[PDB]
Design a protein around this nucleic acid. Structure first.
Ligand SMILES: [Mg+2]
Ligand SMILES: [Zn+2]
Ligand SMILES: [Zn+2]
Lengths: 30, 147, 263, 65, 133, 43, 114, 48, 56, 181, 391, 56, 8
RNA sequence: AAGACCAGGC
């Protein structure tokens, strides 16, 4: 079901998704 | 210090014999005082130990992460499946006499950071050393042999 | 045969479970620690590094080798460098070793304790050998190195004991228990409701009889019988790490009587 | 930063056991805890030794001269 | 070198207020109806339940260090099954001319009551308690 | 090092406080003891 | 920096006897024996086997302070019986107990296959 | 005597909180007083 | 207030404390290192000459 | 996460779904669906402190949502979600923490003022600050002979490369009285 | 250095290892701990300079502090905690140890006291041996609650001729307190005798503890299976006794207690409701922790922590607060953006209903931080302004 | 308030009495008011007290 | 105190 | 060598 709710353990991949792209020091460089 | 404001310095160093121990053989690398717990209130410290005593035996990484769904009641059950007391405590025999300890101990692997600040970088003693110029009093700082 | 008595249980090459009965705990324990700390062994002590391009530092490797387990069979027919009348060292009190490691295999070349030579004269006695128990045949990975990184050492091993340094004691963990059923009451079990149910029963409870409710508290009873297990790291055979222990403790008890006489 | 010869806590050797372990994983596909158990690493003191080592030497080795 | 008390009482009750190895018991005398007894005791070494027939004694005799056994071939004023040593502290008067001395045995308290050892029970530290059956 | 980069200052009893608005944007715990305390926030 | 050389936990230093025996004035027929470069391993073992000679009136031992590997042993015996002797005896009884042990552990061992 | 009472007083003050929570008291109060303040925060007055 | 009511003085030392349960209440264990650094001017007297000539 | 009661199949619901997720653990396994897309699809929003004022944020995505037609006597007692007004959900509460606390185990179990301390001592432990260190000519630098990733960790550590650059070792602790030292 | 005692003359003992090794009982005067704390040492130089240092600044002379006419050094941690255990009627020791214990007392007369028991096994009790440390002529009398010349609960304290007669020994009997056996031994025997008294009471006890062992672990912080429930519903009911007076306020059905605002008077009750709730929440567990709970033990001995502590770890953490009022409305009409406007309830104003053993929820966890944050603040402000006022 | 006091029968006993506390400070005047005890009145403002009742 | 109650 | 600034310690 490519369309269903989203548990807690899921939100992690989102966060993973975050740093994969921004990285700990986004601010400074940006 | 651990990761719980549970900072402390070395008072002495004993060896394996002198050290208190548990039937298994396992002996502590560190012995911190039960007194640094009651008023510090840092309990998670107590928990990291339990959890980590399981992750030790189970090979699985023990999650301590913030607000999750892991409890003290749960871990304790996992530790009973492996063999030791459901609360950590273990029997110990006093390294000097071999007689058991009338009490039991919270024996369990805990992470410890070796903060910088070693004695030999502070120990300083002076008796008539480099005198200042303007004042003629001693000079400042242990590095310049001060007083 | 006579006084205290043994009753070995399942025993192997790296362990020696057994029951020691008819002895005072006091004396069991004494022997306990004596194995843990005062049996003569043989470890590398002096390291003369010539070249070293490894990512590890000099004294880091130096440490490593101090720990590498060497043979110590006829360790007793060697002398402490401190008593030998030779300035520094010699065949009569030391074992010299070589180690050369050139990075050739363009892809991580390893340095195992197996790679140690024994340049000095062993004088025909079991000793100075890189105790290997590894499945393949190169126990204890000293360290790894890349492309053209070299590394030339030269070790000197000496007698010594666990007191002087941990790199000596051949023990390494030792089990000890007694009176699994708290009859002697040398303990006060912690508990929330039931001590007995909440506290793991030991595998040792089967060679001694259960409590039995109807009986009052026996007092005149003393700590007799101890279930142990003597693990070994190599250097000395699990059996000897017990014998020799039993004996060194004795040699000491001796001089206390000897030193006595000289007075 | 290389494997630690002998366990701090009790003393049992553990230098050799590195490759055996890092192997029983990649291939025989066995989970941590179990690997150790067969490698003969009983009580957690030595257990934690292996199960917690982070072999930096590898990355250090990735450097040139 | 004489005895200072002899009388059999009956356990009125046994109390263990939070003590895994000690109980403070009380019991009245079988002779007079004035003598009560309060005594702490090692329930572990010498068990005792309500309604028991015990014989209590006192006195000083069979102070330099304390010899180990060896007295196997020596006196044994131990013809009992419980023998504590202690000291008595206060000498109280409970109305009338009824007296009551307080005995502590290095940590174990005790109280006696009645009035007929007006020339037997002294005010010294000496004091050996004895009990049987 | 990470910490150091993610650091904030604030030129000089109410500012040092952990305000509500601070939720999510700044870490509630990491902040120097004594002297400047609360005048130095981490993200 | 300030810590001694390890080998000070067993080697006697410049002119020093394992044993130094001093008479005790506190009470009659009593002595205090200073054992140098030793510990509980040997102390407590000697202390123990003395409460065995029911001819010994007293026997305790102690480690003044952990930095220094030494220890004091105090002994007091019955009339006209010298404690030093009781130290010998109780000390000998120790070796025998162990002599037997060594032996009983060797025949026992040989009977093993693994 | 002076240095004595001086400390004897200030010492058990280093062990108090700047807070006036849980009438102006504690740390700030002592301050208030030693200054012989002309307008205390809590003046107030009890009459029987 | 900086140089007169308080000055840096000679014959002083400072390091890290850790309590020891085998030291008389009033003692204070000093690291050999330090004792070998701080001195004490003791005039020669026919009571301590012998010991001093040794210490020297 | 944006909530929007956009469910013509129920109630209020996270625009994001388990299909978007596994669509990421896709590119995640590739080591074309970054964080730039999670935003270019209106599934997540950047809320500054001001805008925050006029929104309603739900904590746990799960729990604070499905209806209700017992509970564990261990976990912490949780209040409720008596509201359907929600506009956004929290990626994860354990994200209100910064680098420091992120390494602290169960910071939700200690007296807050303590966490604040460890928050400082961490910047003073030993480990490895880089790997190139062997080619660095800086005054003072310390490397712990043998590191050790902790027996217990924060999911967050994963982005703090902590497991590969530990600040300590796992010591066999024993909380007891002994010599009195 | 804010004390006459922040500087004291000590006997020098050269020892190995790089550190000043000071006695525990002389801890609180300087007010040091060993988490890294450093100490300055000065060396006299004249023959009189020294004397002046030993005749007026010797640590023994300092035992009775003029500022509070009571001692200022007692028995801390291990020694205290254990001295308690060793005293209980249940604590017995046999010959083998009663000997190694007498040996550790340096002044020991060389005479083993007649066993408190001879009947089957010849045993002794702490009360007995601990007493060998107390000099002759030391008379001490106490009386706690139900205390009377046969202290049932073994309360009070009575020491005659320098032998503990009855009662247990802890902070009250051997602390830097008034009646203090120390305060008395100083006064009755002198600086010297009493100064030695420490080391002894110590040496015996510390040694004993070394063998009896002692610890603490999560297990000491968990509440009975049903008690953890009995509490939950003492917060639920307490929650409604709030929802109730909130309904009765959102109706103007309450009068203004003279001098207070209708609003203020609303708080004044909510606060007094949650507080009394929390107060027993903990009290349920307090009496739920047996005479074996280590944490309890460390509290009775008087060597660390109190009720409050247990409470916040096994029951309810408590209400958070800044500037005296429960977590404000920094966000227009709300605590966090995760809340509905105008929520005056406790789950919004900062009441952590959870116990540390269980764990704070984000909200709870945060408020808690904002609360502690205020704390840390003055401990970092009152620190030097207090010093000025001192100066 | 809790005011201990001399029972006719000797012993001291519990005899609480009402008291008015203010929120401001004037003395010279609120002192001569019919119904108070200008022998017990008290403002924490010592500044005042001295001005009205004499430095002592 | 701060983290327990008002009054505390 | 003196000062200033930042950092960190109880
Ligand atoms: Mg400190
Ligand atoms: Zn030689
Ligand atoms: Zn191990």
């Amino acid at each position: 079901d490519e369309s269903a709710p989203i548990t807690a353990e899921d939100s992690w991949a989102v966060i993973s998704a975050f740093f994969r792209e921004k990285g700990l020091v986004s601010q400074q460089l940006d | 210090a651990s990761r719980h404001g549970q900072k402390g310095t070395i008072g002495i160093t004993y060896r394996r014999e002198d050290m208190p121990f548990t039937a298994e053989g396992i002996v502590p690398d560190l012995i911190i005082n039960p007194h640094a717990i009651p008023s510090r209130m840092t309990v998670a410290h107590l928990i990291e130990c339990l959890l980590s005593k399981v992750a030790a035996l189970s090979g699985n990484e023990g999650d301590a992460s913030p607000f999750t769904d892991i409890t003290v009641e749960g871990i304790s059950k996992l530790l009973r499946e492996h063999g030791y007391q459901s609360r950590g405590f273990e029997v110990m025999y006093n390294g000097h006499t071999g007689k058991k300890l009338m009490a039991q101990i919270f024996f369990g692997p805990t992470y410890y950071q070796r903060l910088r600040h070693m004695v030999d970088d502070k120990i300083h003693a002076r008796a008539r050393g480099p005198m200042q110029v303007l004042t003629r009093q001693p000079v400042e700082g242990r590095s310049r042999d001060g007083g | 045969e006579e006084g205290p008595q043994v009753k070995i249980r399942e025993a192997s090459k790296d362990n020696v479970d057994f029951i020691l009965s008819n002895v005072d705990l006091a004396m069991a324990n004494s022997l306990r620690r004596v194995m843990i700390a005062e049996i003569p062994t043989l470890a590398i002590d002096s390291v003369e590094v010539e070249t070293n391009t490894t990512v590890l530092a000099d004294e880091f490797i130096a440490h490593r080798l101090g720990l590498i387990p060497l043979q110590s069979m006829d360790i007793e027919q060697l002398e402490y460098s401190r008593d030998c009348f030779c300035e520094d060292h010699c065949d009569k009190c030391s074992v010299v070793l070589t180690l050369q490691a050139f990075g050739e295999s363009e892809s991580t070349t390893n340095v195992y304790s197996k790679d140690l030579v024994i340049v000095s004269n062993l004088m025909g006695r079991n000793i100075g050998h890189p105790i290997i128990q590894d499945k393949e045949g190169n126990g204890v990975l000293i360290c790894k190195l890349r492309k053209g990184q070299e590394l030339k050492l030269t070790c000197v091993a000496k007698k010594g004991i666990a007191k002087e340094h941990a790199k000596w004691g051949p023990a390494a963990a030792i089990e000890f228990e007694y009176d699994p059923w708290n009859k002697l009451k040398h303990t006060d079990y912690w508990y929330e409701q039931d001590s007995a149910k909440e506290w793991p029963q030991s595998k040792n409870c089967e060679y001694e009889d259960p409590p039995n409710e109807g009986d009052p508290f026996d007092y005149k009873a003393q700590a007799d019988t101890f279930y142990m297990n003597v693990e070994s790291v190599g250097s000395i055979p699990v059996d000897q790490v017990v014998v020799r222990g039993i004996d060194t403790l004795q040699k000491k008890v001796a001089s206390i009587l000897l030193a006595l006489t000289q007075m | 930063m290389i494997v630690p010869v002998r366990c701090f806590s009790c003393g049992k050797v553990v230098g050799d056991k590195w490759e055996s372990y890092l192997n029983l994983l990649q291939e025989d596909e066995l989970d941590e805890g179990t690997a150790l158990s067969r490698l003969g690493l009983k009580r957690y003191c030595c257990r934690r030794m292996i199960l917690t080592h982070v072999d930096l030497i590898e990355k250090f080795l990735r450097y040139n001269p | 070198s004489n005895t200072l008390f002899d009388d059999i009482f009956q356990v009125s009750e046994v109390d263990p207020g939070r003590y895994n190895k000690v109980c403070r018991i009380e019991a009245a005398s079988t002779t007079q109806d004035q003598c009560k007894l309060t005594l702490d005791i090692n329930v572990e070494l010498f068990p005792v339940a309500a309604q028991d027939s015990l014989t209590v004694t006192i006195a000083s005799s069979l102070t330099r260090s304390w010899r180990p056994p060896q007295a196997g071939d020596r006196s044994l004023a131990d013809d009992y099954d419980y023998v504590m040593y202690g000291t008595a502290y206060k000498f109280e008067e409970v109305s009338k001319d009824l007296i009551a001395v307080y005995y502590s045995f290095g940590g174990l308290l005790m109280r006696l009551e009645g009035n007929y050892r007006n020339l037997n029970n002294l005010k010294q530290e000496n004091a050996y308690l004895l009990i049987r059956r | 090092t990470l910490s150091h980069l993610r650091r904030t200052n604030t030129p000089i009893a109410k500012p040092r406080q952990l305000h509500n608005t601070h939720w999510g944007l700044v870490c509630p715990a990491e902040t120097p003891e004594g002297q400047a305390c609360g005048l130095v926030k981490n993200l | 920096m300030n810590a001694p050389d390890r080998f000070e936990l067993f080697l006697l230093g410049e002119g020093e006897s394992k044993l130094k025996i001093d008479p005790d004035t506190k009470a009659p027929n009593a002595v205090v024996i200073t054992f140098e470069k030793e510990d509980h391993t040997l102390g407590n073992l000697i202390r123990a086997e003395l409460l065995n000679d029911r001819k010994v009136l007293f026997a305790a031992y102690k480690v003044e302070h952990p930095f220094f590997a030494r220890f004091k042993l105090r002994i007091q015996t019955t009339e006209g019986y010298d404690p030093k002797d009781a130290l010998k005896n109780a000390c000998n009884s120790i070796i025998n107990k162990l002599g037997a042990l060594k032996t009983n552990f060797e025949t026992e061992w040989n009977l093993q296959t693994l | 005597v002076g240095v004595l009472a001086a400390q004897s007083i200030g010492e058990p003050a280093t062990q108090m909180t700047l807070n006036t929570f849980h009438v102006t008291s504690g740390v700030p109060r002592l301050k208030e007083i030693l200054n012989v303040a002309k307008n205390m925060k809590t003046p107030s007055l009890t009459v029987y | 207030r900086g140089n007169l009511m308080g000055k840096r003085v000679d014959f002083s030392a400072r390091t890290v404390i850790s309590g020891d349960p085998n030291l008389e209440l009033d003692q204070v264990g000093v690291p050999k290192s330090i004792a070998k650094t701080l001195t004490y001017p003791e005039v020669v007297t026919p009571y301590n000459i012998d010991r001093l000539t040794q210490l020297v | 996460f944006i909530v929007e009661d956009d469910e013509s199949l129920g109630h209020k619901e996270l625009k994001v779904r388990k299909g978007h997720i596994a669509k990421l653990m896709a590119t995640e396994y590739q080591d074309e669906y970054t964080w730039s897309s999670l935003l270019n699809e209106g599934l997540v929003e950047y809320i500054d402190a001001e805008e925050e004022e006029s929104i309603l944020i739900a904590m746990q995505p799960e729990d604070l949502e499905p209806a209700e037609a017992d509970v564990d006597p261990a976990k912490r007692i949780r209040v409720s979600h008596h509201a359907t007004t929600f506009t956004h959900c929290e990626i994860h509460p354990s994200m209100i923490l910064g680098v420091a606390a992120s390494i602290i185990p169960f910071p939700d179990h200690n007296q807050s003022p303590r966490n604040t301390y460890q928050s400082a001592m961490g910047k003073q432990a030993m480990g490895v600050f880089l790997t190139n260190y062997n080619v660095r000519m800086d005054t003072m630098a310390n490397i712990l002979y043998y590191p050790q990733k902790p027996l217990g960790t924060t999911r967050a550590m994963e982005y703090l490369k902590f497991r590969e650059l530990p600040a300590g070792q796992n010591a066999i602790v024993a909380i007891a009285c002994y010599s009195g030292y | 250095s804010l004390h006459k005692m922040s500087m004291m003359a000590h006997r020098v003992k050269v020892i190995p290892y790089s550190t000043f090794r000071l006695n525990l009982s002389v801890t609180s005067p300087y007010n040091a701990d060993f988490d890294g704390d450093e100490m300055n040492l000065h060396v006299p130089q004249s023959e009189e300079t020294r004397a002046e240092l030993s005749q007026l600044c010797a640590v023994p002379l300092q035992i009775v502090s003029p500022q509070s006419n009571k001692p200022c050094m007692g028995i801390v941690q291990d020694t205290l905690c254990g001295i308690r255990k060793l005293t209980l009627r249940d604590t017995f020791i046999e010959l083998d140890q009663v000997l190694n214990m007498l040996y550790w007392v340096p002044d020991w007369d060389g005479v083993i006291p007649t066993p408190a028991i001879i009947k089957p096994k010849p045993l002794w009790s702490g009360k007995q041996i601990l007493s060998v440390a107390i000099p002759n002529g030391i008379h001490l009398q106490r009386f706690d609650e139900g205390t009377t010349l046969l202290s049932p609960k073994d309360n009070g304290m009575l020491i005659i001729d320098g032998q503990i007669i009855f009662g247990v020994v802890e902070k009250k009997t051997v602390g830097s307190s008034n009646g203090g056996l120390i305060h008395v031994v100083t006064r009755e025997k002198g600086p010297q005798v009493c100064a030695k008294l420490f080391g002894n009471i110590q040496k015996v006890v510390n040694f004993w503890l070394l063998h009896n062992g002692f610890s603490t672990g999560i297990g000491d912080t968990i509440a009975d299976g049903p008690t953890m429930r009995e509490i939950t519903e003492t917060i639920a009911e307490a929650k409604k006794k709030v929802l109730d007076v909130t309904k009765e306020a959102q109706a103007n059905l309450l009068t203004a207690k003279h001098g207070m605002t209708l609003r203020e008077s609303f708080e004044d009750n909510v606060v007094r409701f949650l507080n009394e709730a929390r107060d027993k929440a903990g009290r349920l567990a307090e009496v739920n922790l047996k005479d074996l709970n280590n944490v309890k033990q460390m509290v009775m001995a008087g060597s660390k922590g109190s009720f409050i502590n247990i409470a916040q770890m096994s029951a309810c953490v408590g209400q958070q607060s800044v500037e005296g009022k429960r977590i404000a409305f920094g966000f227009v009409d709300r605590t966090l953006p995760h809340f509905s406007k105008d929520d005056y309830s406790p789950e919004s104003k900062g009441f952590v209903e959870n116990s540390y053993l269980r764990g704070l929820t984000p909200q709870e966890f945060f408020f808690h931080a904002m609360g502690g944050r205020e704390g840390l603040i003055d401990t970092a402000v009152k620190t030097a302004e207090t010093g000025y006022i001192q100066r | 308030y809790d005011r201990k006091v001399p029972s006719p029968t000797g012993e001291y006993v519990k005899e609480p009495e009402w008291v008015l506390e203010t929120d401001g400070v004037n003395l010279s005047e609120v002192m001569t008011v019919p119904g108070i005890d200008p022998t017990r009145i008290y403002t924490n403002s010592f500044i005042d007290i001295m001005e009205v009742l004499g430095i002592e | 105190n701060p983290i327990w109650g008002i009054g505390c």
